[PDB]
Design an enzyme around this catalytic site. Structure first.
Site, short mmCIF file in Angstrom:
data_model
loop_
_atom_site.label_atom_id
_atom_site.label_comp_id
_atom_site.label_asym_id
_atom_site.label_seq_id
_atom_site.Cartn_x
_atom_site.Cartn_y
_atom_site.Cartn_z
N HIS B 137 0.86 -1.20 0.00
CA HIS B 137 0.00 0.00 0.00
C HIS B 137 0.88 1.24 0.00
O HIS B 137 0.92 1.95 1.04
CB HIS B 137 -0.96 0.00 1.21
CG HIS B 137 -2.04 1.00 1.07
ND1 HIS B 137 -3.33 0.71 1.45
CD2 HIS B 137 -2.05 2.26 0.58
CE1 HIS B 137 -4.08 1.78 1.21
NE2 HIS B 137 -3.31 2.75 0.68
N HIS B 139 1.97 4.92 -1.63
CA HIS B 139 1.70 6.10 -2.50
C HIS B 139 3.06 6.66 -2.93
O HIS B 139 3.87 7.05 -2.06
CB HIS B 139 0.87 7.11 -1.75
CG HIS B 139 -0.51 6.64 -1.45
ND1 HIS B 139 -1.64 7.10 -2.12
CD2 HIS B 139 -0.95 5.74 -0.53
CE1 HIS B 139 -2.71 6.48 -1.63
NE2 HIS B 139 -2.32 5.66 -0.63
N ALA B 170 -3.98 10.95 -2.67
CA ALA B 170 -5.15 10.24 -2.08
C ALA B 170 -5.13 8.75 -2.43
O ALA B 170 -5.59 7.94 -1.61
CB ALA B 170 -6.41 10.90 -2.56
N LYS B 220 -5.86 -0.45 -8.59
CA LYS B 220 -6.44 0.09 -7.37
C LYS B 220 -7.81 0.69 -7.68
O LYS B 220 -7.92 1.55 -8.54
CB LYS B 220 -5.56 1.18 -6.76
CG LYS B 220 -6.21 1.95 -5.60
CD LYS B 220 -6.38 1.11 -4.33
CE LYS B 220 -6.82 1.99 -3.17
NZ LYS B 220 -5.73 2.86 -2.74
N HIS B 222 -10.44 2.95 -5.93
CA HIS B 222 -10.49 3.94 -4.84
C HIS B 222 -11.79 4.71 -4.92
O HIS B 222 -12.14 5.22 -6.01
CB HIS B 222 -9.27 4.86 -4.90
CG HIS B 222 -8.99 5.58 -3.62
ND1 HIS B 222 -9.84 6.56 -3.13
CD2 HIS B 222 -7.99 5.45 -2.72
CE1 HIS B 222 -9.34 7.02 -1.99
NE2 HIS B 222 -8.23 6.33 -1.71
N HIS B 323 -9.13 15.44 4.93
CA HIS B 323 -10.40 15.64 4.16
C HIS B 323 -10.82 17.10 4.11
O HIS B 323 -11.90 17.35 3.57
CB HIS B 323 -11.52 14.81 4.76
CG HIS B 323 -11.99 13.70 3.89
ND1 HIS B 323 -11.18 12.59 3.54
CD2 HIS B 323 -13.20 13.50 3.32
CE1 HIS B 323 -11.89 11.78 2.77
NE2 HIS B 323 -13.14 12.32 2.61
N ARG B 339 -16.43 7.15 10.83
CA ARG B 339 -15.22 6.57 10.19
C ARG B 339 -14.10 6.22 11.20
O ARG B 339 -13.41 5.20 10.98
CB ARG B 339 -14.66 7.50 9.10
CG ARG B 339 -13.36 7.02 8.45
CD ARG B 339 -13.13 7.65 7.06
NE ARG B 339 -11.73 7.45 6.66
CZ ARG B 339 -11.19 7.87 5.52
NH1 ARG B 339 -11.90 8.49 4.58
NH2 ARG B 339 -9.89 7.66 5.32
N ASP B 363 0.43 2.61 3.77
CA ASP B 363 -0.35 3.77 3.28
C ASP B 363 0.60 4.99 3.22
O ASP B 363 0.18 6.15 3.43
CB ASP B 363 -1.63 4.02 4.10
CG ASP B 363 -2.81 4.47 3.27
OD1 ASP B 363 -2.56 5.03 2.20
OD2 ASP B 363 -3.99 4.25 3.70
N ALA B 366 0.04 8.99 2.34
CA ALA B 366 -1.41 9.29 2.13
C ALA B 366 -2.17 9.18 3.45
O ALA B 366 -2.95 10.11 3.75
CB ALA B 366 -2.03 8.38 1.10
AG LIG Z 1 -9.13 12.24 3.68
AG LIG Z 2 -6.91 10.15 4.70
NI NI Z 3 -7.38 4.11 1.03
NI NI Z 4 -3.81 4.79 0.44
O LIG Z 5 -5.53 4.82 1.73
#
Ligand SMILES: [Ag+]
Ligand SMILES: [Ag+]
Ligand code: NI
Ligand code: NI
Ligand SMILES: [O]
Ligand SMILES: [Ag+]
Ligand SMILES: [Ag+]
Ligand code: NI
Ligand code: NI
Ligand SMILES: [O]
Lengths: 100, 570, 122, 570, 100, 100
Positions: B137, B139, B170, B220, B222, B323, B339, B363, B366
């Site tokens: 994962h 980015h 993202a 991916k 998304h 976000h 979330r 991740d 990101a």
């Molecule tokens: Ag976000």
């Molecule tokens: Ag995020």
């Molecule tokens: Ni994600």
């Molecule tokens: Ni990600």
């Molecule tokens: O992610």
């Protein structure tokens, strides 16, 4: 200034030592990289003062004690090694078991 | 003549029955078996055993069962076992795990592990040796992220991005033939293995498939590109044809469906569920139920790993920043509360311990930390031992069962999921020599040496002007494997079979080793080593409580972790 | 004359979105037990099967809200939203696979919606 | 439904009539027009518009009018206008300026600006986007100079040098076929566009021309090599044959002629006059009169830009250090006083404001600052607004006229002068996607992201180990466009037509994009966008006072500048 | 010391903070990078002290006030973000609108 | 912070100056790079204070004297050059023969 690669790197050790000393002054038990940084900078500043390799091998064992550092840090540091310019040129200092 | 077990372990590393603490955790690994012949141990240095006519053979040419490299006296920690062996490397691959040296005078020498004129030596006595970490994962946002990954023992980056473009910031997506070609060329300069994901979005097959033909290694899906039934369906149809994996970050907003709608679109086809707990993304609040299904290969990302007293405060604000949420828009507050859930983060620790979540990942840049996949795997295992006790499967007071379940999460399992475990992800004969040496005191925190294709790529080493390499300052540095053309021979670009068959490497002038993605449509949860549990995961829509076999999964957050303030300068 | 580096001095007035397109108000109910949030540009007839509304009134339309914003439906929530007309070629492909062509094919969209259990095909 | 203009500008960036302050200056730019359809604005992220079946088209393959990259909601500041648009990039070039998205459901979509599976997204809402800066007075002395240039929005370096050799430390010269070949090979590793100048010196044609045939993009006539009538004449004869530009630093000492002698040798042929004010070099005291002639393309170098209270003290000593002058040699003091003149430096500010000096440049590491061409352009414009008031041409209380006159000085005009404006120097369809994003607060000070050939090369971005890329420390860093082979596809080596026709790129193994120099013998002052004024400039030989249309040009030096101590750590 | 890339970078923030604090002590109004450096280092040293993310989100809004910094600096800083090793591992702190 | 390359480099000069000042405070005669570092940082901090180029050209000749430095150091330093951001932008300061 004509800095060479080692001079540029070793500025970082002095800085890490200054950071660690501020952390010790506000009452923190020091961690592994802090402890190494303080003893390393001590050695390099000792060389600059014109101490002998023999004096720094002794002194480096008394810069920090176990009550200055976190649990396990004494046993994580087998030795601390530093090269610095003495009045008689670059020499290697190794401080063995610096913290008990 | 006999040696006591303390002096033996000091000289050669530990042997059968001896235990080793993992860094400053409570976790103990026990040597299960040893390939040595006591007295014929291999070692290198002044007056040592690997010398011509002695432990080094002076007769054989390189082709005649001689190694390019021997790691002496390694403590291997792998899904295949926790055991003591010499590791022999030739042509950049692991060719022998056993006993190295000279059959002239030594008993028990593995026949293809001769130390000869051609052989380099790495002393692994007193080190733990693992496979390089497989981060699926990633980015690609900032090239500075690669050294961060190497410093914590990661050797393969699977994911996507073009640098700090919003699409890439993202989503793990390198979109379209041109972006994929440009990033395959960029990859020529990155000292790590790489596979690139295309955009898993479209309602026609051709726009998706042309990314696979251009050199993508997977897709991916998304939600930021539309995680709709159509984009899910077309991506999996492409993947089944092309033999590549699909990763999914599902529709958190439940805009076009709930979890059951996403599972219906998947229609029993194999998929990798990213950040399955859901703080990193997915159907609110019940995405983590994905991890009970036989066709789902489930990974966590690392910031929820493990559940700590700062986790929730940190994550609620991280999501606000990520976000651009406003505290005075009730819909933003409701979204954030739907979330970021202590109930699912606490359950995630236990699902890891039970072998229901099979994989870790970062991740990176990101919503996750490029250099903390390995670190947080062991912090989780340590927390679970403290809160749940030794697993029932343990013997001899060791944590070997838990250590194999957790090492699998960031080595072999991501490799299997991605279709690359023929090349990487474990210390097995016939696989690429991506190997990480760890001092036990630093295990899972800071790698000693990272070997890429049989050459050291990264090392914690000191003053380059010094008489010896151990004087300060000791820091992570790129080694000769990263320099000049050697960066090509020590690293793998993983690509689709179709891009390979269509000659993309020659078209783009790629000099890196080319790895083939294959065998990732025929697998499921049962194929995840030590992490193969399927079960009905119930997530209460009102309370967010997680149940498995009628039992609520809950644990407390911890105030302190090992592998933290003892080690880090910041 | 306090200087805020890079500050805006925006003109007077308001920006009308989706100017000159027909607007339609409908009631929509989240019959599910999990929250549903709907973006500005999703073909409205293709939203989550558990949203109950007159599906015919979502054909060829989307939410009349600023580009990149969303309407939120908590579990069990019923409320009114305003829709505007799709523009360009008035075709939709993919998403929930209910249209895959002109939005003019209302009977075909509704037949697929009904067969797949998109609530509110009248 | 309506949005107030404050919320609209916060969400999408400003629209028609809205104004934006340039950093901490007094300069305001006004949006002249907007290509959007209100309500169909493109944006990327969770639940946003660029999602499959919505603002992203799910049908079209990359070849079918789909972009590789969309910059959403950009505020363009260019000689062509100050306006709001989406910018579409494909195959490394700008293919569309207008409105991006999905013609399925959106009104007003530019037909070749489809967002599809193949499309990456950069959010430019709330950013100012300009062309990359074109610096035509570069000394190649220290490779560390390239990041300095990228950090202030420069994307093309035209000039010369072999590194810190004295010839290169004084002159923009890569001399002779061998030095030119060696520096074309060096250039393969520099993440910026490059064109190399040969030595514009000789009394025979062949020694000069063989530099053009070897791959030089132009010539430099410098007094340190003998700025004699012969070297001027032979250089321009070569340039007229080869279709390349000649830059001149004239005979400050008036040794072989006065200004009228240099103009007679030029004989009406096109020439680029470097540092035309003369502190950086040229006929004492009247070189700046060059800037009135129709055949002269006049640039300033940056240390005189603009006239400040420390300028004269700094320049007198800088010239002492640069020339090794002695304060006790009366001829050295007389030389320095004849060359560093408040009268011509003050007039230089006003000649810029009047469109009589057409171009900026650095003089990087010889007598100028690699990372301050853009910075000092805007400081000059701001000083002129404060001392001279809005220009007569302004409307709506905006500085749009002055902003187009000044942005032209470091974008389009140097490109036109060098024969490279077919490729670079402006945001126009059909040109190479060299684009700089600026936060308005940092405009002209520190670039957010520098795009080279459609991939980010340089970015202000933070901690590579962090969960997200915005945590400290935020600093200028090389991005994936600089890494591996992608450095070849994202950058242009500009070369003479003859070197291209003779196959020099293949001979030297150059992998970079090859740009052709052309159309720079047929141009003059009239071709300098917004800076096309010809006039009789009189410089009094006794008082050094400058007159245009019988009026003395004078202004005061300023004690403070914007874009200075608010921003810089040193 | 075994410094990793982030440890090497983050030494720079402490240094910039030390420089800025010396400039504040001799009575200068601080500029944008100075202000960011001081608040960032505060956060990282707070983590090292064992403060919570919640404590630093509050404290970071009171390290510098508008009368400590140049005109416009408060409005230039929307937020300051830093990752540091807390007793419970690396966490992200964001201080929103740190200077009014 | 948005550090550019020069800002990142020039932090090193301040650090070397801090190191040199500590060495001077414990009574060492300073060497060549120490002396250069102290005078350079003085100039850059002077610019930040809003001094003129003319003031720093004068002051820089009185930061260190020959009794502060080792034999030969005065004669090794012909001049010290530094560029810093003054209130009116970047300017070059050269201090000629800073130590006699
Ligand atoms: Ag976000
Ligand atoms: Ag995020
Ligand atoms: Ni994600
Ligand atoms: Ni990600
Ligand atoms: O992610
Ligand atoms: Ag000069
Ligand atoms: Ag000179
Ligand atoms: Ni010149
Ligand atoms: Ni020059
Ligand atoms: O120059």
């Amino acid at each position: 200034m004509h800095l060479n690669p080692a001079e540029k790197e070793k500025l970082q050790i002095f800085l890490a030592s200054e950071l660690a000393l501020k952390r010790k002054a506000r009452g923190l038990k020091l961690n592994y990289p802090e402890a190494v940084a303080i003893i390393t900078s001590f050695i390099m500043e000792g060389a600059r003062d014109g101490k002998t390799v023999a004096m720094l091998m002794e002194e480096g064992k008394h810069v920090l004690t176990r009550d200055d550092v976190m649990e396990g840090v004494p046993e994580m540091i087998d030795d601390i090694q530093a090269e610095a310019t003495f009045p008689d040129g670059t020499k290697l200092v190794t401080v063995h078991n610096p913290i008990s | 003549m006999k040696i006591n077990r303390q002096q033996y372990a000091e000289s050669y590393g530990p042997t059968v029955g001896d235990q080793v603490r993992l860094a400053d955790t409570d976790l103990w690994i026990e040597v299960e078996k040893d390939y040595t012949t006591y007295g014929d141990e291999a070692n290198f240095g002044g007056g040592k055993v690997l010398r011509e006519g002695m432990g080094e053979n002076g007769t054989y040419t390189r082709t005649e069962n001689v190694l390019d490299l021997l790691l002496t006296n390694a403590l291997i920690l792998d899904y295949t076992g926790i055991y003591k062996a010499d590791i022999g490397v030739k042509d950049g691959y692991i060719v022998g795990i056993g006993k190295g040296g000279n059959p002239d005078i030594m008993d028990g020498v593995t026949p293809n592990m001769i130390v000869g004129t051609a052989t380099e030596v790495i002393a692994a006595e007193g080190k733990i040796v693992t496979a390089g970490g497989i981060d699926t994962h990633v980015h690609f946002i900032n090239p500075d992220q690669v050294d961060v990954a190497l410093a914590n023992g990661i050797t393969t980056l699977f994911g996507g991005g073009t640098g700090p473009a919003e699409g890439s910031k993202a989503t793990t997506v390198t979109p379209g033939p041109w972006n994929i070609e440009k990033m395959l060329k960029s990859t020529e300069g990155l000292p790590i293995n790489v596979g690139i994901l295309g955009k898993g979005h479209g309602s026609s097959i051709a726009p998706i498939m042309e990314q696979i033909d251009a050199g993508a290694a997977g897709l991916k899906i998304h939600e930021d590109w539309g995680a709709t039934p159509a984009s899910i369906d077309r991506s999996l149809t492409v993947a089944d044809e092309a033999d590549v994996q699909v990763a999914i970050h599902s529709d958190t907003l439940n805009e076009a469906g709930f979890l059951e709608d996403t599972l219906r679109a998947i229609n029993g086809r194999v998929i990798h569920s990213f950040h399955v707990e859901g703080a990193g993304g997915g159907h609110a609040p019940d995405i983590m139920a994905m991890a009970g299904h036989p066709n789902v290969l489930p990974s966590s990302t690392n910031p929820t790993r493990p559940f700590t007293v700062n986790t929730i405060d940190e994550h609620l604000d991280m999501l606000m920043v990520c976000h651009h949420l406003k505290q005075n828009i009730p819909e933003d507050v409701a979204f954030a509360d739907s979330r970021i859930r202590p109930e699912t983060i606490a359950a995630e620790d236990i699902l890891h311990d039970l072998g229901i979540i099979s994989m870790m990942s970062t991740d990176a840049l990101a919503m996750g930390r490029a250099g903390e996949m390995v670190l947080r795997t062991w912090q989780t295992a340590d927390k679970m031992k403290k809160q749940r006790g030794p697993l029932a499967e343990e013997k001899n007071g060791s944590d070997n069962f838990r250590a194999k379940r957790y090492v699998s999460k960031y080595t072999i399992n991501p490799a299997i999921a991605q279709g690359i475990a023929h090349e990487v992800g474990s210390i097995e004969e016939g696989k690429f020599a991506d190997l990480v040496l760890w001092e036990p005191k630093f295990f899972g925190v800071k790698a000693d040496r990272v070997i890429k294709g049989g050459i050291i790529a990264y090392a914690q080493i000191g003053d380059p002007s010094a008489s010896i390499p151990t004087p300060q300052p000791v820091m992570g540095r790129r080694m000769y494997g990263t320099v000049g053309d050697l960066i090509h021979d020590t690293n793998i670009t993983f690509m689709s079979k179709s891009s390979i068959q269509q000659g993309v490497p020659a078209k783009l002038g790629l000099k890196r080793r080319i790895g083939t993605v294959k065998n990732c449509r025929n697998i499921g949860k049962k194929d995840m080593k030590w992490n193969d549990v399927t079960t009905d995961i119930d997530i209460n829509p009102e309370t967010y409580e997680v149940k498995v076999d009628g039992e609520v999964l809950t644990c407390e957050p911890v105030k302190e972790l090992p592998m933290a303030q003892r080690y880090f300068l910041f | 004359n306090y200087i805020v580096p890079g500050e805006y001095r925006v003109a007077e007035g308001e920006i009308e979105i989706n100017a000159g397109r027909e607007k339609t108000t409908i009631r929509v109910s989240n019959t599910g037990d999990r929250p549903i949030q709907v973006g500005s540009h999703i073909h409205f007839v293709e939203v989550n099967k558990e949203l109950l509304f007159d599906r015919a009134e979502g054909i060829g339309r989307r939410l009349n809200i600023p580009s990149g914003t969303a309407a939120r439906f908590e579990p069990g929530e019923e409320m009114e939203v305003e829709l505007t007309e799709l523009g360009g070629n008035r075709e939709v492909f993919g998403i929930s696979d209910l249209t895959n062509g002109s939005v003019d094919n209302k009977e075909l969209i509704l037949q697929r919606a009904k067969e797949l259990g998109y609530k509110g095909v009248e």
